[PDB]
Coordinates of C-alpha atoms in Angstrom, one line a residue:
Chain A
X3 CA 43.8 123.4 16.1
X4 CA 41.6 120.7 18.5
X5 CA 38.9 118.7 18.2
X6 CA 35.1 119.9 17.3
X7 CA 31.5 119.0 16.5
X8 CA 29.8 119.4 13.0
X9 CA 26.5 120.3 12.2
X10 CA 23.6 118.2 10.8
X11 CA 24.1 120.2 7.7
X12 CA 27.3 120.0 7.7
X13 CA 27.2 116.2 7.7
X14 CA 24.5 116.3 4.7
X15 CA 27.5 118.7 2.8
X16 CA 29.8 116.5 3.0
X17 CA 27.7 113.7 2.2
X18 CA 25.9 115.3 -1.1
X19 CA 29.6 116.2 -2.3
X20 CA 31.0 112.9 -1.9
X21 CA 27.8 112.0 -3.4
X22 CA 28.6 114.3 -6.4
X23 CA 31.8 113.2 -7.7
X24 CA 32.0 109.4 -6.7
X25 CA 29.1 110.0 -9.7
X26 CA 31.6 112.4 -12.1
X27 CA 34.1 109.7 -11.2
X28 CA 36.3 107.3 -14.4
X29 CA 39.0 105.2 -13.5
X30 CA 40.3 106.2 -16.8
X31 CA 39.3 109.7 -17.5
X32 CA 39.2 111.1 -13.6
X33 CA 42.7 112.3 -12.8
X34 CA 45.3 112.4 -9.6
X35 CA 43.4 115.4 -8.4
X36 CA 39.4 114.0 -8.8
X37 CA 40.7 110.9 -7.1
X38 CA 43.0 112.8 -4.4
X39 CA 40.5 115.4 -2.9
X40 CA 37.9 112.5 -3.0
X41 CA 40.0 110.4 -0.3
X42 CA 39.5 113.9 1.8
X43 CA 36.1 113.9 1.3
X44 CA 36.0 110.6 2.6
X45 CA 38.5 110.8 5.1
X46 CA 36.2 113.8 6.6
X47 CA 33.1 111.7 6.3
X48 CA 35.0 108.8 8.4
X49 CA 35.9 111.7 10.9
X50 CA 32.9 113.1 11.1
X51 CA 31.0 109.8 11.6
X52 CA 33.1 109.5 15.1
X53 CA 32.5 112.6 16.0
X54 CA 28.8 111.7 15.9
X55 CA 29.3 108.9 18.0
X56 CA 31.4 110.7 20.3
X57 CA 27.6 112.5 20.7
X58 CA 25.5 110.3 20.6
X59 CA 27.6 108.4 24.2
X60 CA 27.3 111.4 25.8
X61 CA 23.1 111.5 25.1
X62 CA 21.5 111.2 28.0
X63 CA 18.0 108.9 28.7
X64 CA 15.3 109.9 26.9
X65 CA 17.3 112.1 24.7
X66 CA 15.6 114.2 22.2
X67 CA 18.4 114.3 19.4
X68 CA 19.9 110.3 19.3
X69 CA 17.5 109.7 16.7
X70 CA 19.2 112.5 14.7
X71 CA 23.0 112.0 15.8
X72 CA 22.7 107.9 14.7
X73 CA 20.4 109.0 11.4
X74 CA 23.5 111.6 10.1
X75 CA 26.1 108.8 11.0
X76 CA 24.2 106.1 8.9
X77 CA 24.0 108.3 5.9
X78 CA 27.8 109.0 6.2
X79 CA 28.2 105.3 6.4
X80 CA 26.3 105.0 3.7
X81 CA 28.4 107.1 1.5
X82 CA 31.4 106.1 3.0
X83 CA 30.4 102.2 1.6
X84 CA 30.1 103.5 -1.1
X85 CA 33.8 104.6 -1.8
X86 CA 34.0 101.5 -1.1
X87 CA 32.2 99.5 -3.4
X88 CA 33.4 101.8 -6.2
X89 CA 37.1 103.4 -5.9
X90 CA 37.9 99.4 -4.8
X91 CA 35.8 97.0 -5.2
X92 CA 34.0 95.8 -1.9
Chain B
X1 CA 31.0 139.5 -11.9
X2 CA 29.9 137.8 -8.8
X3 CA 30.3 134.2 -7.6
X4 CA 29.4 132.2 -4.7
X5 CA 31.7 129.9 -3.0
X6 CA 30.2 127.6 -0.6
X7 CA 31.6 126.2 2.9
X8 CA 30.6 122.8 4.0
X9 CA 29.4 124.6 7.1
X10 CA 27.4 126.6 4.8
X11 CA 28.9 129.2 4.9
X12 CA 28.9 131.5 1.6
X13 CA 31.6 134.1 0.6
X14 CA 31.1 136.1 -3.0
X15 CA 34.2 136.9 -4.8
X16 CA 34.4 139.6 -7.3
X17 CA 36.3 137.8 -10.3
X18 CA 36.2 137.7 -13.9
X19 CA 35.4 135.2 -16.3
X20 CA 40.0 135.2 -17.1
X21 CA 40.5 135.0 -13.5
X22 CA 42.2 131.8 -13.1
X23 CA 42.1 128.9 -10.0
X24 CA 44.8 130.4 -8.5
X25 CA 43.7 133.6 -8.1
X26 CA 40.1 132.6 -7.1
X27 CA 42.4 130.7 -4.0
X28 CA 43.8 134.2 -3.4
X29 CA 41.0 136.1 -3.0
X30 CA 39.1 133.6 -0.2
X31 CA 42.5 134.0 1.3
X32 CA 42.5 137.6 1.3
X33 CA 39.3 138.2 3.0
X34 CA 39.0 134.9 5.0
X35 CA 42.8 134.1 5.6
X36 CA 42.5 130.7 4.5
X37 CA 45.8 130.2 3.2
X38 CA 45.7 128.8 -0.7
X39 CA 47.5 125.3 0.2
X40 CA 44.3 124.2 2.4
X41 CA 42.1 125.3 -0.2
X42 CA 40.0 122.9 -2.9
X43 CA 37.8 124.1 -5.1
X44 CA 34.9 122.0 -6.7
X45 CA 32.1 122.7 -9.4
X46 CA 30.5 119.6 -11.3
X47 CA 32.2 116.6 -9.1
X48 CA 35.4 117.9 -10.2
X49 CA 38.6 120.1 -8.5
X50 CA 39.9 122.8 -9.7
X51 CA 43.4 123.1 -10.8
X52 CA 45.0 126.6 -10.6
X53 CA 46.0 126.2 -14.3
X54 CA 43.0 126.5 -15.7
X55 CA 40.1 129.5 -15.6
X56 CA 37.2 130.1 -14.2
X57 CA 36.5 130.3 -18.0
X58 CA 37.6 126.6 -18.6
X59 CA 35.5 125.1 -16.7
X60 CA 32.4 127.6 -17.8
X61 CA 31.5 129.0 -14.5
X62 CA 28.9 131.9 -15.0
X63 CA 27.9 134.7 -12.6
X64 CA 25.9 133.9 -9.6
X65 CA 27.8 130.1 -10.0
X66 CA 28.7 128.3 -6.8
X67 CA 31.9 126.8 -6.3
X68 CA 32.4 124.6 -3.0
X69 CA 35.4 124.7 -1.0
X70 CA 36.8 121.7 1.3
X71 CA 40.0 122.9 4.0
X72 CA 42.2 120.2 4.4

């Protein structure tokens, strides 16, 4: 399979569901699997953020969706900080 | 009874199971009618996966519930 685009809503998913166990997460009682399927999550959200970008430099003057495009990308950024901050440390 | 398992495109595909199916056999069914083979397939409910092991029943999914899957 190739490259594609995601949606908005897709984005938001992926977001809320990161969102959703990085909360239901313990170092001690979260298991292999928890922590395993949340480094997909993540590793999707740090996909889908360049896929965003690869949008937003193909936007042309004036264009009616940027706003969007960069808004999606700083909310996966935000979650993506925040397996960050948590599952390491900083 | 009927469930509801959720895409992250959105998409939303209703398996027919029982409250003794188990994890496994939920991953069989999407792959029967969607072809998504069970290896690519992670369940979630709660913040938490799904391990083939345990039921439906374990982790006290009712009818009309929504599970979420993620493709690898």
């Amino acid at each position: 399979v190739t490259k594609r685009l995601h949606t908005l809503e897709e984005v938001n998913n992926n977001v809320r569901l990161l969102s959703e166990m990085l909360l239901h997460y313990s170092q001690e009682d979260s298991s292999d699997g928890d922590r395993e399927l949340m480094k997909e999550l993540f590793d999707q959200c740090e996909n889908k953020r360049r896929t965003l970008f690869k949008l937003a430099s193909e936007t042309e003057d004036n264009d009616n969706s940027l706003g969007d495009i960069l808004q999606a990308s700083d909310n996966l950024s935000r979650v993506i900080n925040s397996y960050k901050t948590i599952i390491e440390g900083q | 009874m009927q469930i509801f398992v959720k895409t992250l495109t959105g998409k939303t595909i209703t398996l027919e199971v029982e409250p003794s199916d188990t994890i496994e056999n939920v991953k069989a069914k999407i792959q029967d009618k969607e072809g998504i083979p069970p290896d690519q397939q992670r369940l979630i409910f709660a913040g938490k996966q799904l391990e083939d092991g345990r039921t439906l029943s374990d982790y006290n999914i009712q009818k009309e519930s929504t599970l979420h899957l993620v493709l690898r």
